[PDB]
Amino acid sequence: MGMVVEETRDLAETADCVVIEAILVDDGLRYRQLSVGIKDENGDIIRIVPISTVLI
Amino acid sequence: MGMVVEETRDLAETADCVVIEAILVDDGLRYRQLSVGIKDENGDIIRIVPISTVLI
Amino acid sequence: MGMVVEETRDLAETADCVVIEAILVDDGLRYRQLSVGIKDENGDIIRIVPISTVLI
Amino acid sequence: MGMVVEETRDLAETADCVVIEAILVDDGLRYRQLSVGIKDENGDIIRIVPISTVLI
Numbered sequence: 001m002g003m004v005v006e007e008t009r010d011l012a013e014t015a016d017c018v019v020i021e022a023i024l025v026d027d028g029l030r031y032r033q034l035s036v037g038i039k040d041e042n043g044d045i046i047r048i049v050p051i052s053t054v055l056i
Numbered sequence: 057m058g059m060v061v062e063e064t065r066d067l068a069e070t071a072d073c074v075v076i077e078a079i080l081v082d083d084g085l086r087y088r089q090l091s092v093g094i095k096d097e098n099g100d101i102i103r104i105v106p107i108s109t110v111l112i
Numbered sequence: 113m114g115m116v117v118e119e120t121r122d123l124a125e126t127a128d129c130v131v132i133e134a135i136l137v138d139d140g141l142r143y144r145q146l147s148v149g150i151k152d153e154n155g156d157i158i159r160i161v162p163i164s165t166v167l168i
Numbered sequence: 169m170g171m172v173v174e175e176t177r178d179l180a181e182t183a184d185c186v187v188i189e190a191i192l193v194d195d196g197l198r199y200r201q202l203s204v205g206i207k208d209e210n211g212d213i214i215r216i217v218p219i220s221t222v223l224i
Contacts (some may be wrong), residue, residue, distance in 0.1 A: 009165050012105050013138055015077055016072035019167060021081060029217070031057050034107055034167070036092050038070050049068050049197065051075060051107060054223040067223050068197055075223060085161070090223070105141065109165040 002026065015039070020048070023056075032056045060084065071095070076104070079112075088112045114138055130157065138152065144168045170194055186213065192221065200224045 003026035012019040016039050024031040035052040037045040059082035068075040072095050080087040089109040093101040124131040129148050132137035136143040149157040151162040171194035180187040185204050192199040201221040205213040 012092075013104075014073075014103070017070075017094060018091060019092060019105060035214075036068075036073060038073060038077060047070070049070075049075060049223075050194075050199075051222075051223050053218075055217075055219050085124050087162075105167075106138075106143075106165075107167050109162075111161075 006030075016046070024053070030056050062086075074101070080109070086112050118142075127151070132160065135168075142168050174198075183207070188216065191224075198224050 003007060003010050003024055005022055006025050007023040008022075009021040010018055013033075014033045014046065020035040020037050022033045022035065024033055031053050034051045036049045038047040038049065040046050059071075059080055061069050061075050061078055062081050063079040066074055067076040067077050069091075074095065076091040078089045078091065080089055090107045092097045092101040092105045092107060094105065096102050118136055118137050119133075119135040121132060121133040123133050124148075128151055130151060132147040132149050134145040134147065134161050136145055143165050147162045150159040150161070151159050152158045156159060171192050174193050174211055175189075175191040176183075177189040178186060179189050184207055186207060188203040189206050190201040190203065192201055199221050201218060203216050203218045206215040206217070208214045
């Protein structure tokens, strides 16, 4: 724990990949993280590849 | 044209998706663009989904 | 040109500069672009300098 | 904890603040983290505030 995920959002999606946004809160500060999720044949996310996190 | 792609780079790759970086130069300014490329069964990129561009 | 400007907004203004926000839509996805406008003595904007674009 | 700090670097320093850079490696990918360190009267850093992390 320690850091808390407050919100997630699907920004763009494909058969195989999805661009994810998360709002993180750690030690009283708010961050916006953009990630790429990797989907298998069943449409599930098998790997998250964080791309960028920024203070907001 | 007008804007010039100066450099591209593979930051992370998967069977299906790749995280791309490009250095763009437009009107004398330099930008770093992060994108997600969508790959087909043959490993080729069929769609680029820009995620973020920032002045550097 | 593929991308469509859907909204602009004046976020902050100064004697010399103004912070502009735009919502861009390209290939069905929405982006938030922040720019800085340069104002002359006559109160007009003489140059717009894009700072960052991000998928929203 | 999955992610490994591989390099830190002092990019700029001031009476009160110091700009820190770190290279993080997680799941085989490398990230560049920029933080701000807060210095007290005794020249020591009292708080580190992460500003941005990006895949490189």
